[PDB]
Scaffold this active site. Sequence first.
Site, PDB file in Angstrom:
ATOM      1  N   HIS A 150       0.821  -1.209   0.000  1.00  0.00           N
ATOM      2  CA  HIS A 150       0.000   0.000   0.000  1.00  0.00           C
ATOM      3  C   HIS A 150       0.859   1.266   0.000  1.00  0.00           C
ATOM      4  O   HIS A 150       0.327   2.353  -0.104  1.00  0.00           O
ATOM      5  CB  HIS A 150      -1.055   0.024   1.130  1.00  0.00           C
ATOM      6  N   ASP A 179       0.229  -7.859   1.500  1.00  0.00           N
ATOM      7  CA  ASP A 179       0.663  -6.464   1.543  1.00  0.00           C
ATOM      8  C   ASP A 179       2.172  -6.412   1.671  1.00  0.00           C
ATOM      9  O   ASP A 179       2.704  -6.149   2.754  1.00  0.00           O
ATOM     10  CB  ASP A 179      -0.009  -5.772   2.734  1.00  0.00           C
ATOM     11  N   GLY A 214       2.377   6.596   9.113  1.00  0.00           N
ATOM     12  CA  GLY A 214       3.748   6.984   8.818  1.00  0.00           C
ATOM     13  C   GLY A 214       4.746   5.851   9.077  1.00  0.00           C
ATOM     14  O   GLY A 214       5.928   5.938   8.673  1.00  0.00           O
ATOM     15  N   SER A 232       3.911   2.543   8.291  1.00  0.00           N
ATOM     16  CA  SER A 232       3.676   1.505   7.286  1.00  0.00           C
ATOM     17  C   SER A 232       4.936   1.154   6.502  1.00  0.00           C
ATOM     18  O   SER A 232       5.730   2.032   6.149  1.00  0.00           O
ATOM     19  CB  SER A 232       2.631   1.949   6.276  1.00  0.00           C
ATOM     20  N   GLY A 233       5.103  -0.133   6.220  1.00  0.00           N
ATOM     21  CA  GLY A 233       6.253  -0.595   5.470  1.00  0.00           C
ATOM     22  C   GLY A 233       7.494  -0.821   6.296  1.00  0.00           C
ATOM     23  O   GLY A 233       8.420  -1.471   5.831  1.00  0.00           O
TER      24      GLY A 233
END
Lengths: 56, 221
Positions: B40, B84, B173, B175-176
């Site tokens: 995402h 994801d 912020g 995410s990932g």
Amino acid sequence: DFCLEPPYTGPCHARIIRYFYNAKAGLCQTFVYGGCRAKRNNFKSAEDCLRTCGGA
Amino acid sequence: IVGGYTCGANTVPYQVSLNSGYHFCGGSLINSQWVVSAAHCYKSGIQVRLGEDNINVVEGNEQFISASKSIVHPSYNSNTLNNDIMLIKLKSAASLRVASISLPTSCASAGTQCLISGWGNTKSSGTSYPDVLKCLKAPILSDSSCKSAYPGQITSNMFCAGYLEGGKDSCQGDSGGPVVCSGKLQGIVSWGSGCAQKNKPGVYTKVCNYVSWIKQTIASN
Ligand SMILES: [Ca+2]
């Protein structure tokens, strides 16, 4: 009218700056979008936002 | 990261910031030329920033490298958030304060303590984005409790981590970014219901399920 809906950040945790039409202010404003499950009042630019929702 | 602490300059050397004019997601360096993040977080014009501590000021240890390719998992589903995961190839190799993190040999068990890191919002709720990297130690939760917190939303490719009491969690912020348990990359910050809410722990992509896909994909690109 999706242009009158409040901005939706969603469940994902990114910090992506998008635009939404703010009917009260009569302008497109920025908000933090999480990266997934966007609703329609969510644009990548102020121009797109104004073209689609401007004056709603 | 809500309820965490300041990691300390370059103490999480595999942590990277994905920049598109501003920090929008984190990622983990798993090779001198490859970064893993969430699907995402896919965006065009990504610049990867390595060796970062204070993302707002140049401190000398940084390496800004553009992405040459961004490969989202072919089965990523934007509606269910299943699969994801995304791989980003760097335009040039990073000079290894900057180090890669190892992929897991096996999945981690409930109870395992892990380090979650990021430059995301530090307020449950409110808004306050930090300058420096924040850290949080959180345990992996059982599939049973994860599924109880999010009925019909947890897949075999996701795991929960955190505290049921709330107060300590990942947030916008982050995410990932990495969930390292240990010394192995076990998760990728993915989603949740708000941040640090009671009975609503964060959900992470289960990296141990993608190790073969990752290795082969890196090798043929
Ligand atoms: Ca810096």
